Design a protein around this ligand. Sequence first.
Ligand SMILES: *[C@@H]1O[C@H](CO)[C@@H](O[C@@H]2O[C@H](CO)[C@@H](O[C@@H]3O[C@H](CO[C@H]4O[C@H](CO[C@H]5O[C@H](CO)[C@@H](O)[C@H](O)[C@@H]5O)[C@@H](O)[C@H](O[C@H]5O[C@H](CO)[C@@H](O)[C@H](O)[C@@H]5O)[C@@H]4O)[C@@H](O)[C@H](O[C@H]4O[C@H](CO)[C@@H](O)[C@H](O)[C@@H]4O[C@H]4O[C@H](CO)[C@@H](O)[C@H](O)[C@@H]4O[C@H]4O[C@H](CO)[C@@H](O)[C@H](O)[C@@H]4O)[C@@H]3O)[C@H](O)[C@H]2NC(C)=O)[C@H](O)[C@H]1NC(C)=O
Ligand SMILES: *[C@@H]1O[C@H](CO)[C@@H](O[C@@H]2O[C@H](CO)[C@@H](O[C@@H]3O[C@H](CO[C@H]4O[C@H](CO[C@H]5O[C@H](CO)[C@@H](O)[C@H](O)[C@@H]5O)[C@@H](O)[C@H](O[C@H]5O[C@H](CO)[C@@H](O)[C@H](O)[C@@H]5O)[C@@H]4O)[C@@H](O)[C@H](O[C@H]4O[C@H](CO)[C@@H](O)[C@H](O)[C@@H]4O[C@H]4O[C@H](CO)[C@@H](O)[C@H](O)[C@@H]4O[C@H]4O[C@H](CO)[C@@H](O)[C@H](O)[C@@H]4O)[C@@H]3O)[C@H](O)[C@H]2NC(C)=O)[C@H](O)[C@H]1NC(C)=O
Ligand SMILES: *[C@@H]1O[C@H](CO)[C@@H](O[C@@H]2O[C@H](CO)[C@@H](O[C@@H]3O[C@H](CO[C@H]4O[C@H](CO[C@H]5O[C@H](CO)[C@@H](O)[C@H](O)[C@@H]5O)[C@@H](O)[C@H](O[C@H]5O[C@H](CO)[C@@H](O)[C@H](O)[C@@H]5O)[C@@H]4O)[C@@H](O)[C@H](O[C@H]4O[C@H](CO)[C@@H](O)[C@H](O)[C@@H]4O[C@H]4O[C@H](CO)[C@@H](O)[C@H](O)[C@@H]4O[C@H]4O[C@H](CO)[C@@H](O)[C@H](O)[C@@H]4O)[C@@H]3O)[C@H](O)[C@H]2NC(C)=O)[C@H](O)[C@H]1NC(C)=O
Ligand SMILES: *[C@@H]1O[C@H](CO)[C@@H](O[C@@H]2O[C@H](CO)[C@@H](O[C@@H]3O[C@H](CO[C@H]4O[C@H](CO[C@H]5O[C@H](CO)[C@@H](O)[C@H](O)[C@@H]5O)[C@@H](O)[C@H](O[C@H]5O[C@H](CO)[C@@H](O)[C@H](O)[C@@H]5O)[C@@H]4O)[C@@H](O)[C@H](O[C@H]4O[C@H](CO)[C@@H](O)[C@H](O)[C@@H]4O[C@H]4O[C@H](CO)[C@@H](O)[C@H](O)[C@@H]4O[C@H]4O[C@H](CO)[C@@H](O)[C@H](O)[C@@H]4O)[C@@H]3O)[C@H](O)[C@H]2NC(C)=O)[C@H](O)[C@H]1NC(C)=O
Ligand code: NAG
Ligand code: NAG
Ligand code: NAG
Ligand code: NAG
Ligand code: NAG
Ligand code: CA
Ligand code: CA
Ligand code: CA
Ligand code: CA
Lengths: 388, 388, 388, 388
Amino acid sequence: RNFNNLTKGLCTINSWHIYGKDNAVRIGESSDVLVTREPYVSCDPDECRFYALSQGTTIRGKHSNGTIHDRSQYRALISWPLSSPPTVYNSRVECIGWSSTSCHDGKSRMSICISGPNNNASAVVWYNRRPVAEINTWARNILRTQESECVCHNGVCPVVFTDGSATGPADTRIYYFKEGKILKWESLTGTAKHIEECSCYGERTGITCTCKDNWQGSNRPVIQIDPVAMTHTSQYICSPVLTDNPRPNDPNIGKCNDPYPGNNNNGVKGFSYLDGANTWLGRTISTASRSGYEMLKVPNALTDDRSKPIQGQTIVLNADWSGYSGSFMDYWAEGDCYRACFYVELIRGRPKEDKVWWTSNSIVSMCSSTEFLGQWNWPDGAKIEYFL
Amino acid sequence: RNFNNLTKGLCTINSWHIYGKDNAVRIGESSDVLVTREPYVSCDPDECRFYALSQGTTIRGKHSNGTIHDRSQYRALISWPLSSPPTVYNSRVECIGWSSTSCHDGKSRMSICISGPNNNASAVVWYNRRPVAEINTWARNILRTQESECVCHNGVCPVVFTDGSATGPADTRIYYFKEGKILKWESLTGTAKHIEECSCYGERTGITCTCKDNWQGSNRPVIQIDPVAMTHTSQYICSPVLTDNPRPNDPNIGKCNDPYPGNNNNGVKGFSYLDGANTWLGRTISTASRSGYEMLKVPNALTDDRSKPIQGQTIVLNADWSGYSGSFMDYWAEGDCYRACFYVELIRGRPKEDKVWWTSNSIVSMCSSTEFLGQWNWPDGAKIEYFL
Amino acid sequence: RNFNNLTKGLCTINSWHIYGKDNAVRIGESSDVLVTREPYVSCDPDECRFYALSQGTTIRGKHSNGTIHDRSQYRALISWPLSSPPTVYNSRVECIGWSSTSCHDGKSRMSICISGPNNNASAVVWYNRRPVAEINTWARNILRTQESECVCHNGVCPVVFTDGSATGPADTRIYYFKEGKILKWESLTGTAKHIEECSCYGERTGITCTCKDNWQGSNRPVIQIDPVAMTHTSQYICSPVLTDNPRPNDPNIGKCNDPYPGNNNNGVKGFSYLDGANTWLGRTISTASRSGYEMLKVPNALTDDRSKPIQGQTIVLNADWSGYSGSFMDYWAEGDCYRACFYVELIRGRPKEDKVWWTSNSIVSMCSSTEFLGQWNWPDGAKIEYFL
Amino acid sequence: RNFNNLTKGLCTINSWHIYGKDNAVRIGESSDVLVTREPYVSCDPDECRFYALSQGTTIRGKHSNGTIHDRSQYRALISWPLSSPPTVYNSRVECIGWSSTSCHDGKSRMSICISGPNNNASAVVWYNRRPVAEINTWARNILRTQESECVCHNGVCPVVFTDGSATGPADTRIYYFKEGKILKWESLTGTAKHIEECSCYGERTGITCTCKDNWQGSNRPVIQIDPVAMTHTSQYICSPVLTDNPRPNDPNIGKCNDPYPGNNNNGVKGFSYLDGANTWLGRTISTASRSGYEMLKVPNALTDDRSKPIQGQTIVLNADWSGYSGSFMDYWAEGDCYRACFYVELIRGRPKEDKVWWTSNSIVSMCSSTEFLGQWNWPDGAKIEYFL
Ligand SMILES: *[C@@H]1O[C@H](CO)[C@@H](O[C@@H]2O[C@H](CO)[C@@H](O[C@@H]3O[C@H](CO[C@H]4O[C@H](CO[C@H]5O[C@H](CO)[C@@H](O)[C@H](O)[C@@H]5O)[C@@H](O)[C@H](O[C@H]5O[C@H](CO)[C@@H](O)[C@H](O)[C@@H]5O)[C@@H]4O)[C@@H](O)[C@H](O[C@H]4O[C@H](CO)[C@@H](O)[C@H](O)[C@@H]4O[C@H]4O[C@H](CO)[C@@H](O)[C@H](O)[C@@H]4O[C@H]4O[C@H](CO)[C@@H](O)[C@H](O)[C@@H]4O)[C@@H]3O)[C@H](O)[C@H]2NC(C)=O)[C@H](O)[C@H]1NC(C)=O
Ligand SMILES: *[C@@H]1O[C@H](CO)[C@@H](O[C@@H]2O[C@H](CO)[C@@H](O[C@@H]3O[C@H](CO[C@H]4O[C@H](CO[C@H]5O[C@H](CO)[C@@H](O)[C@H](O)[C@@H]5O)[C@@H](O)[C@H](O[C@H]5O[C@H](CO)[C@@H](O)[C@H](O)[C@@H]5O)[C@@H]4O)[C@@H](O)[C@H](O[C@H]4O[C@H](CO)[C@@H](O)[C@H](O)[C@@H]4O[C@H]4O[C@H](CO)[C@@H](O)[C@H](O)[C@@H]4O[C@H]4O[C@H](CO)[C@@H](O)[C@H](O)[C@@H]4O)[C@@H]3O)[C@H](O)[C@H]2NC(C)=O)[C@H](O)[C@H]1NC(C)=O
Ligand SMILES: *[C@@H]1O[C@H](CO)[C@@H](O[C@@H]2O[C@H](CO)[C@@H](O[C@@H]3O[C@H](CO[C@H]4O[C@H](CO[C@H]5O[C@H](CO)[C@@H](O)[C@H](O)[C@@H]5O)[C@@H](O)[C@H](O[C@H]5O[C@H](CO)[C@@H](O)[C@H](O)[C@@H]5O)[C@@H]4O)[C@@H](O)[C@H](O[C@H]4O[C@H](CO)[C@@H](O)[C@H](O)[C@@H]4O[C@H]4O[C@H](CO)[C@@H](O)[C@H](O)[C@@H]4O[C@H]4O[C@H](CO)[C@@H](O)[C@H](O)[C@@H]4O)[C@@H]3O)[C@H](O)[C@H]2NC(C)=O)[C@H](O)[C@H]1NC(C)=O
Ligand SMILES: *[C@@H]1O[C@H](CO)[C@@H](O[C@@H]2O[C@H](CO)[C@@H](O[C@@H]3O[C@H](CO[C@H]4O[C@H](CO[C@H]5O[C@H](CO)[C@@H](O)[C@H](O)[C@@H]5O)[C@@H](O)[C@H](O[C@H]5O[C@H](CO)[C@@H](O)[C@H](O)[C@@H]5O)[C@@H]4O)[C@@H](O)[C@H](O[C@H]4O[C@H](CO)[C@@H](O)[C@H](O)[C@@H]4O[C@H]4O[C@H](CO)[C@@H](O)[C@H](O)[C@@H]4O[C@H]4O[C@H](CO)[C@@H](O)[C@H](O)[C@@H]4O)[C@@H]3O)[C@H](O)[C@H]2NC(C)=O)[C@H](O)[C@H]1NC(C)=O
Ligand SMILES: *[C@@H]1O[C@H](CO)[C@@H](O)[C@H](O)[C@H]1NC(C)=O
Ligand SMILES: *[C@@H]1O[C@H](CO)[C@@H](O)[C@H](O)[C@H]1NC(C)=O
Ligand SMILES: *[C@@H]1O[C@H](CO)[C@@H](O)[C@H](O)[C@H]1NC(C)=O
Ligand SMILES: *[C@@H]1O[C@H](CO)[C@@H](O)[C@H](O)[C@H]1NC(C)=O
Ligand SMILES: *[C@@H]1O[C@H](CO)[C@@H](O)[C@H](O)[C@H]1NC(C)=O
Ligand SMILES: [Ca+2]
Ligand SMILES: [Ca+2]
Ligand SMILES: [Ca+2]
Ligand SMILES: [Ca+2]
């Protein structure tokens, strides 16, 4: 086995095809399905799996009461087979904590979980299912990380962390791991003014992370990482097609080096694929809440502050709840290009559906096609009334 | 590992022995058993498995309400160990969709799932558990496929698709895949006037598919495929032993090149083994509904429009519900011949049993014996009253 | 991998130690545990497993109603990990039927299941998880077999079958299989007058089977099989220590070549280890019913019609229900001798406990020790009242 | 594969990081989770697993009534994947009994279970999942062992057993096993006056076991084992930081060679890492009951009768129930040192919480870090009221 190298460009994205969907909430109405949130997808060289943070209880279990809560001692990063739901009997625990990232380097998988109280949190880095390194909070204010997969190149797997305020300047760091060991870390540089929950992907040009500015900006900050030199830059997506939520309406001039104003102290984890004329952006349909999801083809969105959509695809209808969204790719697939993929978290329960006392989600996932495929919409599909 | 080649003839069929039965509905009265329909069986070189389209809910789950529905976003092709029931915890998702086929080529398995709305459906072709190719609807009217296993020869796995009307002329295509890639496709040729849900098997003479004419014919259309030349022909089973359902009574002259008339706009997926004097046909016992199942030995049924049965075997009593039936064989078994096998879908629930609000099924499966074995009958075995 | 050869003698049996116990009925009060009966244990070269005939329903399931029934289309031979209970999610189906045997030859496992109606039953022989040969009923009266493991030598695995009356002369055959193929079969010879449900084990002296005479004898018939010559002889255990159930009291002279009289048309499957001064016999404690179980050291029981016990061990108290018992050994263990093992079926429910409507069992298993270990008793442990 | 050798020293312990937590009681409120107690953790070279003694019933099962009981025929040592809960479907039975130890020697795992009545108990030694040796009670008064992992060096795995009184002088033996065979055993020597439930770990200096004096001492007895010479010595932890429970308040002079007095005929299984200036001791926070848990850095605790803490870490708050605690290490991890680990048993139910009729537990586990990480507290997390 060799470390994987990012040697391919992205496949041309002409549409998106269904890749995975677990229907977890539907099935969990009558099955031992774990309550989760903050899910993602990540591939090994021989298998792709669903990942999420469990709440240490099933949905029908009485302990599901109060699972809107973000950070308890009963959370853990679990993984489970593609498109199966996260059950008590099929879920593998990667590590314990309430914020996570995970990626395979071609030889073995690194998983990182953060746990602790707000002022004394710590990250534990697992490599090949063993704890290897630990990192203590540096700002003493909810040390936290990506909530989607990291990406590796020749053994080096960069990870973005934030520690500090969610509503002001915070201390963001980029760590560079190899076999779970810390090679190097650096403070965030560039023009991004606030960084949360980076969604990343890799290709020959390097590693690209699309994140969340929770403080002031409804445009998304971007961090571009060189995994060989172990350095990075940051800015925003220049495009006036704004992709955070909640957000103002799309203007005609975006902002490259500062937050686009209108909504403060809120946001959602999201993603984009930034690739010249092959650029696609994901966003919720609603500008007010985490509902609906669509992909928009926006040529040169990263660099062009006038850029608008020329093609699109609805993923989830606005009538249906969405949530976090993030990127991943099967870096070990056949062919000459990397096929862009993403997942959307379909949040059910609180705060939007408060007739139940829990909060959970299911997953839908798509990958790009070079065909121009017909589109459908993909709801969670559970009826809240059944849980009453 | 090498691609499998169709080098053997069929074993002599003197009777049928029990091969597999999951008792899914009985067990699912009190277990987390997924609601399914459209099941089949398919073998890998080291394992044979049950396949079906899940409805993304268990039977006892409240979301089982309304599972008579054919095409939702909550369906997926699942596979599970032979004769076990399809449970939440033991079922592996092959792909997402509401119509499917799957087959192993000796090296890896290809699975195809179709999804989307009626006018914008698309097929995704998976090979070795990764998406490889995609096909958009060409007639914009429920792009759909076999609902039983395909067959491969030297890496080439032909698959039959239909897109268009179910009650008139439709656009049927034969696709030829290798490692999930499209080598070639061709429009349906020959004398078959309507094609649905082909059940196929392979032997040295080529690949034989017995399908369903839903439009006008109660005799079954046959497609014979050369997987080397990648061409095919079509006709009907000439025999007056009619095998669709519903159907007229058996006349004394069948039809080779046109539908036998009497029942329009209906039918059931079925199968046959067409092999000269070793020919056996499957059919429901009832001519009015999907109840009972029997095998009939009808020499030269394919070519002889006067041919009648000389031997038979009851599989399911007429008092018991049946459903879809299809062919498969263990192409990797020991010996000098391929042992013909089939499954019968035992549909429980709606529309025939409407005291419950769900629709599901169990599976029974048989293979041929060169002995003349005693016969039994194989009901689903669940009591509807228990679910009330 | 090589075929296993019976090259060792039995280890000296000075006592019995606990080997396995699944507590299936206790656990199945609140878990998806399959209803079973007729269990056994059998080893592969890398694993030992529990085996039993499922009833195609869980205990709490409403379909457990009526599981006193012996032969339905919903039964199957299942196997599952040692000391785990037989659950819906962990049980592997070996074949479909209501009477069975199974054994590994060192290369692969042969499993045989019989199914059908009383007058038209058939056996299907599976080898390496594929059906290989089939045998039709020869007496048309419940073709049936061992209900415990067979034994192999150099690829040859003898199996005892009976077809015909249970209350009169029947047609017993000894079949000799290799890789699932029939090498030879022969009619029962010797002085045993009726044969049911043989429990067998192998050692350098050959294969020894202790069976059940259901017709007239409360002593047990013995069949001794030469697996190289593929021949056998039969007689009874000469000892006046009688081991069937129900049975008369122990006299002072047993019978070597005819049934010991007193109880007609009844009996239980049981076993013995017949090895000169190392002979141990198993029996129920009660002479009237399937309750309790004890092992008795009876030197030369096979040949000495005056032989009495000189040592013993209680396995299950007379206050507790027992049932079938049979032999197995780990033929692939380290050392210079084969360690004698056995299981006892602990039957719960009907007909003895008719407040519930089901019939099932758990398993307890022991192996011999060269130490003189303290003894305990091993009840099923479930409280019937909980199921009410 | 080679036998593992203890060639490394302990890593420097500057703090403790979260390693594993199963949340078993929370999840078992609504899942088929086995009732357990006396858990531990033990590693294979490719996997680390949770271990515990099952009670042969789930928590919601009615048979959970009365599981405060220590020694029934329905107990078994089970193991299951790290941080998953012990479920009916994911738990592997290692052996049958009500007291246990287990360890991997680098080639295969040895497991030992004791069973029987108080006056006739016996140990069965399993190696590579097969029973190899048996040991009968020598004092006829609850033959019993460690309840946490043993440790091996070059194939030799020492185990501590006690047989006899819990409230007076008993017969403690140290056994030395290789591949499950008894190489040697010896009577307890040294100054420890009573030995129960040793928690052991290995490093280049040998094997160190921290045990429990149930008779008179609230300081802990220590047994130091040379696995090459197969000899040992014993004494107490000299430190006045007392670590049994219940216990007197910490004085300023401890006792090296006799029990520290104050609490008779009680105690809890616990552990320590005794390593000069790298010494850490675990104890309950309360001096009266099994509540809370903390680690204390006490330089030279083993030899210095004046030694006091200079650093510490709270693991479980005093408001939360704890229980048994013990040591383990991943002897097959990368690096130049062995990372000290421990688990704490979080007992829920009786006798402290008698509104429910059962007794069970969950597990929390930690390993050492060379960082000085922030601390959290780790409760079981279940609400008793939910089970009412
Ligand atoms: C079967 O399946 C297929 C495959 O999915 C289906 O085909 C798909 O159909 C959908 C639905 O229409 C399409 O999605 C939309 O795409 C358009 C972009 O394409 C249009 O515009 C292109 C660009 O035009 C500009 O440049 C060209 C030159 O480059 C110039 O000629 C032109 O004049 C103009 O200057 C055109 O090139 C393009 O034409 C091409 O494609 C046509 C088919 O689409 C074809 O007919 C032509 O021949 C040609 O080939 C086409 O005209 C996106 O604009 C659109 O996204 C907007 O609208 C949706 C609502 O539907 C909304 O959700 C989006 O967010 C977005 O609108 C918001 O943002 C805008 C940008 O800021 C803003 O301007 C809007 O006002 C709006 O903003 C408001 O809402 C948002 C969101 O809440 C909020 O944030 C704001 O603040 C504000 O409130 C769709 O993505 C697919 O592209 C199309 N795919 C294919 C392959 O055809 C087919 O329909 C299915 N069949 C059936 C029977 O169902
Ligand atoms: C233990 O197990 C064994 C093994 O299973 C059991 O043995 C089996 O028993 C069953 C039940 O009888 C048999 O199935 C039937 O087979 C017959 C065919 O065999 C008969 O006919 C043969 C052909 O005869 C013709 O040609 C020969 C020369 O070739 C000529 O001599 C003769 O005069 C005639 O011209 C005979 O060769 C054959 O004899 C041989 O076998 C005998 C045993 O069967 C043996 O005794 C002889 O010595 C000799 O060796 C025998 O006579 C099928 O015809 C039949 O299928 C029809 O009937 C069933 C109802 O049972 C029905 O469901 C079928 O659909 C079908 O009938 C419909 O279709 C017909 C064709 O279109 C039509 O003509 C009918 O009117 C009818 O149509 C109506 O219903 C259908 C369906 O709803 C509907 O679609 C129509 O519109 C319409 O409404 C059975 O398959 C097995 O073959 C037999 N197996 C063996 C190995 O023996 C044994 O019974 C068990 N033991 C116990 C104790 O239970
Ligand atoms: C800790 O654990 C250990 C290990 O388990 C426990 O030790 C065990 O204790 C049990 C219980 O006693 C023993 O089981 C019994 O074994 C005896 C056989 O051993 C006795 O007899 C031997 C033979 O004596 C004959 O020959 C010798 C010369 O060879 C001659 O000297 C003698 O006079 C006589 O002629 C003796 O050798 C033996 O002595 C040796 O062992 C002694 C310890 O046992 C020791 O003290 C001595 O020093 C010496 O070393 C000993 O005396 C079995 O006979 C007995 O089985 C019968 O009884 C049980 C009831 O307990 C019954 O269930 C059996 O079915 C059977 O009785 C029925 O069948 C008989 C034969 O047909 C019949 O004659 C009876 O009338 C009776 O029949 C009735 O009931 C049955 C069943 O329902 C029915 O079918 C009939 O129709 C009828 O109604 C037990 O198996 C273990 O052997 C012993 N093991 C060891 C290693 O010691 C220890 O107790 C535990 N400690 C504690 C504190 O609990
Ligand atoms: C973020 O996370 C971090 C990391 O966890 C948190 O930092 C941790 O904070 C905790 C809580 O304070 C600390 O745990 C305690 O550690 C002390 C030991 O350290 C103190 O004492 C050291 C030794 O001093 C002695 O020697 C030195 C020279 O060697 C001499 O100078 C000195 O005068 C004295 O002679 C000091 O070296 C040490 O200072 C160092 O560290 C400081 C930070 O701690 C730092 O500020 C300094 O600059 C310097 O670097 C420090 O002063 C333990 O003593 C203590 O354990 C006792 O107390 C707890 C209650 O909290 C109790 O549960 C324990 O059982 C124990 O107390 C019992 O036992 C004693 C011994 O027998 C007895 O004397 C007591 O009376 C008491 O006995 C009673 O209760 C018990 C239990 O029920 C019963 O059995 C008895 O019978 C009786 O009833 C704690 O373990 C961590 O060490 C510290 N870690 C780090 C890395 O800093 C941080 O707080 C978090 N941040 C936030 C915002 O929350
Ligand atoms: C990636 O690059 C390194 C260094 O050039 C090489 O040694 C390694 O084999 C490469 N990995 C793969 C999968 O080729
Ligand atoms: C099938 O035929 C091809 C081409 O003749 C050959 O290369 C291949 O090995 C064959 N497959 C098997 C299983 O023999
Ligand atoms: C199924 O759904 C319908 C509503 O469409 C409802 O009237 C009916 O009662 C439901 N059945 C059950 C079992 O609740
Ligand atoms: C058993 O005997 C045969 C023939 O003598 C030999 O070929 C085979 O290898 C033996 N099996 C084993 C496991 O040694
Ligand atoms: C441990 O030591 C022995 C004897 O010196 C050696 O043979 C063995 O290989 C060692 N084990 C390992 C894992 O190196
Ligand atoms: Ca924002
Ligand atoms: Ca038709
Ligand atoms: Ca009898
Ligand atoms: Ca004590």
